[PDB]
Design an enzyme around this catalytic site. Structure first.
Site, mmCIF file in Angstrom:
data_model
loop_
_atom_site.group_PDB
_atom_site.id
_atom_site.type_symbol
_atom_site.label_atom_id
_atom_site.label_comp_id
_atom_site.label_asym_id
_atom_site.label_seq_id
_atom_site.Cartn_x
_atom_site.Cartn_y
_atom_site.Cartn_z
ATOM 1 N N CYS A 140 -2.633 0.606 -13.385
ATOM 2 C CA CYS A 140 -2.777 0.710 -12.185
ATOM 3 C C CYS A 140 -3.790 1.419 -11.547
ATOM 4 O O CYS A 140 -5.163 1.380 -12.301
ATOM 5 C CB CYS A 140 -1.363 1.147 -11.303
ATOM 6 S SG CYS A 140 -0.536 2.721 -12.311
ATOM 7 N N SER A 141 -3.855 2.448 -10.662
ATOM 8 C CA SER A 141 -4.981 3.334 -10.339
ATOM 9 C C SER A 141 -4.817 4.413 -11.367
ATOM 10 O O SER A 141 -5.732 4.840 -12.190
ATOM 11 C CB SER A 141 -5.000 3.922 -8.761
ATOM 12 O OG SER A 141 -6.137 4.548 -8.753
ATOM 13 N N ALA A 142 -3.619 5.276 -11.386
ATOM 14 C CA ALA A 142 -3.684 6.185 -12.415
ATOM 15 C C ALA A 142 -3.005 5.836 -13.670
ATOM 16 O O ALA A 142 -3.194 6.651 -14.888
ATOM 17 C CB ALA A 142 -2.783 7.612 -11.899
ATOM 18 N N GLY A 143 -2.437 4.856 -13.841
ATOM 19 C CA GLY A 143 -1.632 4.354 -15.091
ATOM 20 C C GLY A 143 -0.467 5.090 -15.573
ATOM 21 O O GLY A 143 0.062 5.133 -16.484
ATOM 22 N N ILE A 144 0.384 5.677 -14.514
ATOM 23 C CA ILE A 144 1.697 6.296 -14.573
ATOM 24 C C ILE A 144 2.806 5.826 -13.765
ATOM 25 O O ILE A 144 3.906 5.776 -14.151
ATOM 26 C CB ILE A 144 1.462 7.797 -14.595
ATOM 27 C CG1 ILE A 144 0.969 8.349 -13.193
ATOM 28 C CG2 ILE A 144 0.700 8.309 -15.595
ATOM 29 C CD1 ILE A 144 0.894 9.737 -12.955
ATOM 30 N N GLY A 145 2.393 5.364 -12.640
ATOM 31 C CA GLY A 145 3.495 4.964 -11.414
ATOM 32 C C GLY A 145 4.099 3.491 -11.572
ATOM 33 O O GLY A 145 5.060 3.270 -12.302
ATOM 34 N N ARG A 146 3.265 2.523 -11.052
ATOM 35 C CA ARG A 146 3.613 1.100 -11.189
ATOM 36 C C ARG A 146 3.498 0.682 -12.671
ATOM 37 O O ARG A 146 4.592 -0.179 -13.150
ATOM 38 C CB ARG A 146 2.345 0.382 -10.224
ATOM 39 C CG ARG A 146 2.575 0.373 -8.848
ATOM 40 C CD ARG A 146 1.352 -0.257 -8.179
ATOM 41 N NE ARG A 146 1.336 0.226 -6.772
ATOM 42 C CZ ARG A 146 0.491 0.123 -6.100
ATOM 43 N NH1 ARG A 146 -0.608 -0.845 -6.333
ATOM 44 N NH2 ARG A 146 0.163 0.604 -4.659
ATOM 45 N N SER A 147 2.647 1.328 -13.510
ATOM 46 C CA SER A 147 2.647 1.039 -14.776
ATOM 47 C C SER A 147 3.872 1.202 -15.603
ATOM 48 O O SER A 147 4.522 0.743 -16.610
ATOM 49 C CB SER A 147 1.325 1.667 -15.360
ATOM 50 O OG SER A 147 0.139 1.140 -15.096
ATOM 51 N N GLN A 152 6.431 7.881 -10.469
ATOM 52 C CA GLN A 152 5.766 9.038 -9.640
ATOM 53 C C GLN A 152 6.705 9.503 -8.513
ATOM 54 O O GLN A 152 6.107 10.520 -7.920
ATOM 55 C CB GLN A 152 4.328 8.520 -9.155
ATOM 56 C CG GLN A 152 3.181 8.422 -10.219
ATOM 57 C CD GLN A 152 1.880 7.905 -9.598
ATOM 58 O OE1 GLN A 152 2.047 6.663 -9.236
ATOM 59 N NE2 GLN A 152 1.063 8.817 -9.522
ATOM 60 N N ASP A 183 0.647 -1.221 0.034
ATOM 61 C CA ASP A 183 0.020 0.013 0.094
ATOM 62 C C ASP A 183 0.756 1.495 0.001
ATOM 63 O O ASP A 183 0.510 2.245 -0.541
ATOM 64 C CB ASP A 183 -0.859 -0.056 1.335
ATOM 65 C CG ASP A 183 -2.527 -0.545 0.828
ATOM 66 O OD1 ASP A 183 -2.475 -1.234 -0.001
ATOM 67 O OD2 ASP A 183 -3.086 -0.297 1.751
#
Ligand SMILES: c1csc(-c2ncc[nH]2)c1
Length: 284
Positions: free
Chosen positions: A215-222, A262, A181
């Site tokens: 992912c949630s926003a599509g920029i970090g983990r993605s 991010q 998390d």
């Protein structure tokens, strides 16, 4: 500089935040006018994360062709990816329309539906074989075929049917279930194992449309997923693998979608993943 020793030099000097801010300063800025039209407000999860106009995926629809999704086309590596936000209650039908129209084989999901006590994306696939989903706005049917639950990830086989034409296709859902998390994983070993499983499925190969990753926003983990994949492929292709410059690859990918990676912790984790992954590839 090479990667592994540049890495230790940033650790010893404690300058990850400065390196990451340099990337933010040099990153491309392109217009995202379609994303900001008033009619598209409930199609965006976050007001500060939008697809650029030049690289956005268009739905094949004449009323409204907008989805928060971007095509990342990596020319030297010969790999493409579609990066998108976690679907919203009013965009699950658009999401599966995109999968169909772009001829994707795989969907890569890097978040849980609930994290930190809040909803991070809609429950957009069926959880029981006998309870299929129908998306009436885009005329698609989606059925769970099988599910394989492992310790760090789950793989699902799904059937997508275009109800207009009665054509069907098999889609693979690769769900990384254990990203913490807060922060990043302590070791990249389970994330690399997951990446190799996606590769082994055919979902990243040129005989299919681009993989859809979110992912949630599509920029970090993605961003971490596609950055690590592309860097490892380049290290296999080139005569001199130490010439692969992860910061330059990241800036190239940011020409196609804003904000990839991010935090400075995600940047350091991407270095770690590429470094450890390059040892397992060989030839080790
Ligand atoms: C976040 C942005 S829009 C949104 C939504 N749409 C419908 C229900 N919740 C959540």
């Amino acid at each position: 500089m090479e990667m592994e020793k540049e890495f230790e030099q940033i650790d010893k000097s404690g300058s990850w935040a400065a390196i990451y801010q340099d990337i933010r300063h040099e990153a491309s800025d392109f217009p995202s006018r379609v994303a900001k039209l008033p009619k598209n407000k409930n199609r965006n999860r976050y007001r500060d994360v939008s697809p650029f106009d030049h690289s956005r995926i268009k739905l094949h629809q004449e009323d409204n062709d907008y989805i928060n999704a971007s095509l990342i086309k990596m020319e030297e590596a010969q790999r493409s990816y579609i990066l998108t936000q976690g679907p919203l209650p009013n965009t699950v039908g658009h999401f599966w329309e995109m999968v169909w129209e772009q001829k994707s084989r795989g969907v890569v999901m890097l978040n849980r539906v609930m994290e930190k006590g809040s909803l991070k994306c809609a429950q957009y696939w069926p959880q029981k074989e006998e309870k299929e989903m129908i998306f009436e706005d885009t005329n698609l049917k989606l059925t769970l075929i099988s599910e394989d639950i492992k310790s760090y990830y789950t793989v699902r086989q799904l059937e997508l049917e275009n109800l207009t034409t009665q054509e069907t296709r098999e889609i693979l859902h690769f769900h990384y279930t254990t990203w913490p998390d807060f922060g990043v994983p302590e070791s990249p070993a389970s994330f690399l194992n997951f990446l190799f499983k996606v590769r082994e499925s055919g979902s990243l190969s040129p005989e299919h449309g681009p993989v859809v990753v979110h992912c949630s926003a599509g920029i970090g983990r993605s961003g971490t997923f596609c950055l690590a994949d592309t860097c490892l492929l380049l290290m296999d292709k080139r005569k001199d693998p130490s010439s692969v410059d992860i910061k330059k690859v990241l800036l190239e990918m940011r020409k196609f979608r804003m904000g990839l990676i991010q935090t400075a912790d995600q940047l350091r984790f991407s270095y770690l993943a590429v470094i450890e992954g390059a040892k397992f590839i060989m030839g080790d």
